[PDB]
Amino acid sequence: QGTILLDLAPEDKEYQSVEEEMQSTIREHRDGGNAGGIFNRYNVIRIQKVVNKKLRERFCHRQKEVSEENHNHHNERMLFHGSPFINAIIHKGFDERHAYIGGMFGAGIYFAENSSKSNQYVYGIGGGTGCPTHKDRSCYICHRQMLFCRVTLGKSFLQFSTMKMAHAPPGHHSVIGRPSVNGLAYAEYVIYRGEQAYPEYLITYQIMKPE
Ligand SMILES: CC1(C)OC(=O)N([C@H]2CC[C@H](c3cnc(N)c(-c4ncccn4)c3)CC2)[C@H]1c1ccccc1
């Protein structure tokens, strides 16, 4: 009924596959490490498959709708997501009702192809005040969580800024904020319907200090 978390073993190719994507999508960010910490690698301590009959089924039902309106192409894609609400997400699914127009963001759920981008948000916008125990955005002690999700993008509307969007434009199912000068540095994939993202993998890790 609820969700069941399935431990993958490091010997399992799926485990290796998921970690590789994470480690390899670490990229340098213009903030000197202020948001997600200074690190050149992660210590992946755990990777669990998220199994939830209800959620999978809703996700599949939505994927079919988007498909009929996108010429039978649901445009599914694997993307990362980091936020202080992962534990809620893996049990109740993504819920746009917690997405609000504010600051540099529209009322949608944001994803990223780069694991280090998602890491910048695990403790809040701009990293917030860091981990709860040491209030350190660069804590190497506390364990972090991020999701490698299945994301139904359907027909994406491309634009430079995504901060005052309430829903995907007419005819579309997602919005991609693209790089610009004086703008974004990495593309941001946004959905406005929770059902368009299934949290396939729960990644437990720590950023490692440089050597
Ligand atoms: C900047 C935004 C646009 O990028 C996101 O992806 N955000 C999501 C993160 C998670 C959130 C969310 C999505 N699904 C949920 N299910 C819950 C959630 N929270 C509390 C209780 C129950 N559920 C929260 C909505 C916006 C936002 C966000 C908000 C605050 C911190 C980090 C990230």
Ligand SMILES: [Zn+2]
């Ligand atoms: Zn800490």
